Design a protein around this ligand. Structure first.
Ligand SMILES: Cc1cc(CO)c2cccc(NC(=O)[C@H]3C[C@H](N)C3)c2n1
Lengths: 39, 156
């Protein structure tokens, strides 16, 4: 049986760690809401 | 229960100790998370009970106490912030320029950041602080690394 606890406000934080790339991906979405790579 | 706007952890005791299964957003009295986190189960906010109101397994979204409220969209150009809330660890912004999921039905923002599954439901923000979608439904690429979609609902 699941419960929720607060973890913060929702705010943009200037000089946060900038990271990760920007890939363009061909994907399909099935009826179970799972994405897959088209190839 | 606590209805203050903000980001929350989704906890269960049904397993060993207390386990973080996901994350969500409280806005305008409605709690927003991903369907695979709760499976549409009711939630507790202290002594308050939260009852599912809307949900769609294909969108992998669900809302509690009212209709989906978050209607902000990636502009297609700007960097975003993932407000990650990992299990056992403090909330932490991570700035990134999102990639693209190309599908037969149109193009979706994507973020290339790998976090634990229990981070699912963490929101993604624009520069004005508005939630443009939730993290936790995506794909594993040639490498072995994870890429989440930017998943956004419709506000009626
Ligand atoms: C294999 C894997 C890995 C990570 C991190 O490494 C994940 C991180 C967050 C969410 C996941 N799950 C999903 O994308 C959806 C697919 C279902 N609807 C749940 C993750 N799956």
């Amino acid at each position: 049986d699941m419960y929720i606890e607060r973890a913060g406000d929702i705010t943009w934080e200037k000089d946060a760690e900038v990271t990760g790339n920007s890939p363009r991906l061909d994907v399909a979405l099935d009826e179970s809401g799972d994405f897959s790579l088209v190839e | 229960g606590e209805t203050t706007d903000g980001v929350y952890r989704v906890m269960t005791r049904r397993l060993l100790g207390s386990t973080q299964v996901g994350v969500g957003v409280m806005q305008e009295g409605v709690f927003h998370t991903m369907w695979h986190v709760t499976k549409g189960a009711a939630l507790r906010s202290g002594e308050g009970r939260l009852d599912p109101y809307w949900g769609d397994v294909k969108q992998d979204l669900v809302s509690y106490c009212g209709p989906w409220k978050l209607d902000a969209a990636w502009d297609g150009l700007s960097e975003v912030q993932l407000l990650a809330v990992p299990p056992g660890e403090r909330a932490k912004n991570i700035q990134t320029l999102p990639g693209i999921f190309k599908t037969k039905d149109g193009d979706i923002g994507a973020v290339a950041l790998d976090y634990p599954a229990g981070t699912s439901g963490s929101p993604i923000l624009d520069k004005c602080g508005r939630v443009i979608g939730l993290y936790g439904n995506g794909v594993v690429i040639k490498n072995g690394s994870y890429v989440s979609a930017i998943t956004q609902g419709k506000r009626e």
